[PDB]
Amino acid sequence: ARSIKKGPFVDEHLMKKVEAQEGSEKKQVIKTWSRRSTIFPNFIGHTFAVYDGRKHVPVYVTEDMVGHKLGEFAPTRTFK
Amino acid sequence: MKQGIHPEYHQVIFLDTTTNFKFLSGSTKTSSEMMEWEDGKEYPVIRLDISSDSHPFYTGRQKFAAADGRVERFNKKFGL
Amino acid sequence: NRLKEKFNTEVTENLMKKFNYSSVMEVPKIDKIVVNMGVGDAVQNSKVLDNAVEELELITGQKPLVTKAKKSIATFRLREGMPIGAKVTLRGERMYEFLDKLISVSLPRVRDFQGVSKKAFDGRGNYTLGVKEQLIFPEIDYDKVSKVRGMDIVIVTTANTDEEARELLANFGMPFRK
Amino acid sequence: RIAGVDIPREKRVVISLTYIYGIGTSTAQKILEEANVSADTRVKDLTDDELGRIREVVDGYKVEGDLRRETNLNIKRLMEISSYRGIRHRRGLPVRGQKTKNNARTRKGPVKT
RNA sequence: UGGGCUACACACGUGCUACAAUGGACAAUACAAAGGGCAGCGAAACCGCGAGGUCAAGCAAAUCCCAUAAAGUUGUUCUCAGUUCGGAUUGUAGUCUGCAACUCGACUACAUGAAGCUGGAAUCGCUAGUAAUCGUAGAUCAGCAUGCUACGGUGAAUACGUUC
Ligand SMILES: [Mg+2]
């Protein structure tokens, strides 16, 4: 959770999916409804199709993006 | 040089208080304080907060450490 | 002439060894240091140039030459013959004193100094430096100056190439951005 | 002059130090405490030795351009990573989730009716 | 399950906080009312700059806790400016609640330091414990109030009068 004492929050289903990909030499696109899950350092190099509420928007994790939730990068509202 | 068209110019000692660096060069600036020099004369002394040796760039000393990487800060923050 | 002494001794040796100069005469030297100030604001107010002139006179240690417009431009509201600048040419001992002070005191005093640009050479071995404010120079006091104004310092070198000039300035101890 | 900035001479040192970027009243109190320089004594009346001591402490804290550069870099990174916060920075709209229907003038600038 | 109701060139209504010296900051030092509480109110002690945490007494209530009211009073300092006014915005590191604070919480620390120099035309409330001002409590409620509904403290000016 937010508090330091609690570990960085990640959804188990998202985490387990990433874990399987770690072993694989070539990573595959991940469909995730987990906007709330934090981007871990392990997530680097993984592509996540985060749901924007109507469609899944592709997100590629990089070093800089770590420590930011996957949901942040996907946009739920459209203007102009 | 034409006489009386130029501002008064005289040798003055420039001192870096921080690094205790003294050098004698001419300046229009007049100082009440004067100090004995290597040369057998007394010259007015100008005090400088920062000099070549004082300024970090010249020395190449780094005052502060570089910012932690995003992966690094994540690991450090939650001790993982 | 502490900077001159360096040039006379260690610097001469470094340059001649580096570029395999056949004669001592070949070794580069700084012909002149010229400080340029532009006062287009003088068009708007006569006082501004006069104030700048005072500042330049103190920093340089010699009276500046007022520079007048060659041609009239409507956009700049410029009229030919109007006073729009002040220049000083420092040569001989005065030059060496100015340069040593600039590198030793004034350039350090520059705010958030990251070194001088390495690319600021005309391609003919002559370097130009632009100071953002004249407050960096020690003589000027912050109270005395009403408005901060930049200055250009032009180092003209006998060096044929910039590289030779760069080595001369580096041996002089000029900060380089790298 | 401390940290490349000339603090007002007339004002008391404690307040004068706040003028330096990256220094606030809290730090200004702390830097004087470490310097062992009294807050009461005014900058104009400050002794030369005291001034040097203040400078040493101020140097230890990140101040002026170094802090400015860091802050800019963080904002640049957010814009680079295309973070929602970063996108709002690019839009020039409230970044921290303040409502934009009304108000939001400081971020949005003057009214264009 | 996730998003939206939290969109943002703008217009309007109702509010909140300022534009300082009848003030700002700091230190010391007083005087209320009306309410809430069982797995809830949580003292004290220790730890933290603080938000909090740790441990844990009492207390189903004229007993214990929320909870020290604040303005005030007396000193000290600043000295008429966009400031030692103001505190929007943004960066960073935290705390707490919750399965989960990305969209979209509250709070803290540090830094940053906007507009604002008392407001065009126009327009609102109030005849006394009222207005004005200063804090206090409660419902809803995991958390979340500048709103709402209650409470006291200090405490005015003026009303010739009925042409409009
Ligand atoms: Mg609604």
Side-chain angles (χ1 to χ4, degrees):
Chain A
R2 180 106 78 108
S3 60
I4 293 301
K5 50 184 60 179
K6 302 176 187 177
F9 164 79
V10 57
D11 281 296
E12 54 178 0
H13 37 86
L14 183 52
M15 176 53 73
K16 68 175 178 54
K17 220 167 290 80
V18 185
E19 287 173 357
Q21 295 210 356
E22 305 173 6
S24 305
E25 289 186 0
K26 50 179 60 179
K27 301 171 182 182
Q28 305 177 1
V29 181
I30 298 182
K31 282 194 58 179
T32 172
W33 283 262
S34 312
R35 299 177 59 74
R36 46 175 187 176
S37 296
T38 313
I39 291 174
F40 268 74
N42 172 61
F43 285 27
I44 297 173
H46 293 88
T47 308
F48 302 90
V50 184
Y51 196 39
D52 73 2
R54 59 168 160 181
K55 62 180 178 296
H56 295 88
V57 177
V59 175
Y60 178 83
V61 175
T62 194
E63 190 272 358
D64 295 2
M65 287 173 50
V66 169
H68 301 271
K69 311 296 194 172
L70 268 172
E72 308 191 4
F73 299 94
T76 60
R77 297 185 191 116
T78 299
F79 194 78
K80 303 301 182 180
Chain B
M1 292 195 169
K2 300 177 179 172
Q3 312 294 63
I5 81 159
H6 298 281
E8 189 274 356
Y9 196 91
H10 59 324
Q11 287 277 64
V12 305
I13 305 172
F14 289 91
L15 163 62
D16 184 13
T17 171
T18 308
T19 325
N20 199 3
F21 168 41
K22 294 166 49 64
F23 75 90
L24 172 67
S25 71
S27 181
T28 184
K29 193 71 172 184
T30 71
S31 176
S32 60
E33 174 189 358
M34 308 180 60
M35 194 179 308
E36 299 182 0
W37 184 251
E38 311 160 4
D39 309 1
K41 294 179 183 178
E42 193 179 3
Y43 308 94
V45 191
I46 316 290
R47 294 176 169 289
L48 294 314
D49 313 358
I50 188 169
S51 290
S52 178
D53 26 291
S54 181
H55 189 276
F57 183 85
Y58 293 82
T59 41
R61 171 198 58 112
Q62 306 306 300
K63 305 196 299 175
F64 318 101
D68 300 1
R70 289 294 305 179
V71 48
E72 305 177 1
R73 66 177 291 292
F74 190 95
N75 293 302
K76 131 267 164 182
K77 171 163 37 62
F78 286 96
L80 72 148
Chain C
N1 62 297
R2 173 261 291 179
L3 183 60
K4 192 178 190 300
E5 180 182 0
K6 291 175 52 179
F7 170 75
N8 294 356
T9 311
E10 52 177 356
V11 175
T12 297
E13 296 289 357
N14 298 358
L15 294 175
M16 70 192 312
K17 293 164 189 174
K18 186 169 184 296
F19 306 100
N20 306 358
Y21 289 140
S22 60
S23 178
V24 57
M25 304 302 294
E26 290 188 354
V27 173
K29 59 183 178 181
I30 304 179
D31 183 69
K32 60 177 184 177
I33 288 185
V34 182
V35 193
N36 167 60
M37 282 196 316
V39 199
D41 311 358
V43 171
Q44 308 309 120
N45 182 10
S46 60
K47 299 179 58 59
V48 185
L49 174 58
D50 193 6
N51 300 126
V53 153
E54 176 186 359
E55 303 166 9
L56 194 60
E57 194 168 7
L58 294 173
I59 294 173
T60 58
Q62 70 175 244
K63 189 178 67 182
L65 180 84
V66 173
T67 77
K68 301 172 186 177
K70 176 194 302 181
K71 194 177 304 180
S72 54
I73 309 182
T75 78
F76 297 148
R77 291 174 292 182
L78 186 62
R79 193 105 321 174
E80 169 178 0
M82 283 209 299
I84 65 171
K87 106 175 183 178
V88 156
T89 60
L90 292 156
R91 307 186 181 251
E93 291 185 0
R94 285 300 201 72
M95 157 183 58
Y96 282 103
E97 292 161 356
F98 182 87
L99 187 55
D100 104 296
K101 287 183 299 183
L102 173 67
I103 298 170
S104 299
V105 169
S106 181
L107 276 171
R109 280 173 54 115
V110 174
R111 297 202 55 238
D112 191 61
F113 191 42
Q114 312 295 354
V116 317
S117 175
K118 192 186 178 185
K119 306 149 299 303
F121 286 83
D122 60 351
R124 308 168 189 296
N126 311 301
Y127 173 86
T128 313
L129 168 71
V131 316
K132 295 176 301 303
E133 61 173 0
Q134 24 73 356
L135 258 56
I136 64 173
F137 292 92
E139 158 53 56
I140 298 304
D141 295 2
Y142 89 98
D143 290 301
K144 293 177 179 177
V145 149
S146 178
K147 175 187 175 175
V148 287
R149 181 178 297 291
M151 309 152 59
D152 302 318
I153 308 172
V154 191
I155 300 172
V156 180
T157 315
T158 52
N160 297 301
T161 81
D162 300 352
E163 308 297 350
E164 300 170 3
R166 287 174 175 178
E167 301 315 302
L168 173 63
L169 292 185
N171 296 359
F172 273 29
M174 173 79 71
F176 272 90
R177 189 174 302 169
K178 299 134 45 189
Chain D
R1 178 185 172 179
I2 310 177
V5 165
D6 192 296
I7 66 186
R9 296 170 51 66
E10 300 178 1
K11 307 300 179 57
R12 296 172 57 242
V13 56
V14 49
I15 301 300
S16 308
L17 292 163
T18 66
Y19 286 84
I20 306 174
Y21 185 98
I23 298 295
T25 176
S26 178
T27 47
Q29 293 164 242
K30 287 189 297 290
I31 63 190
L32 283 174
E33 290 163 5
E34 180 172 356
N36 312 120
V37 176
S38 178
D40 297 300
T41 171
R42 317 189 82 73
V43 176
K44 55 185 177 64
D45 310 304
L46 270 173
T47 317
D48 194 5
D49 58 354
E50 295 169 0
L51 224 307
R53 288 148 50 186
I54 309 167
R55 289 177 178 119
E56 300 157 6
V57 179
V58 172
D59 181 61
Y61 294 83
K62 185 171 296 181
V63 287
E64 289 303 303
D66 299 6
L67 190 50
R68 294 204 189 72
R69 180 165 47 252
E70 164 62 7
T71 55
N72 293 124
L73 289 173
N74 306 127
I75 303 176
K76 292 160 191 165
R77 190 186 64 72
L78 286 171
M79 296 166 58
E80 174 183 359
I81 68 181
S82 77
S83 178
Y84 175 85
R85 290 174 54 184
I87 301 175
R88 301 210 70 68
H89 274 277
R90 301 193 298 256
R91 291 181 178 183
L93 285 169
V95 174
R96 299 190 180 181
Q98 306 95 304
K99 288 192 178 185
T100 59
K101 185 175 189 182
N102 301 298
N103 309 356
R105 285 291 151 237
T106 181
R107 293 255 59 234
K108 290 176 67 184
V111 175
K112 290 173 293 303
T113 182

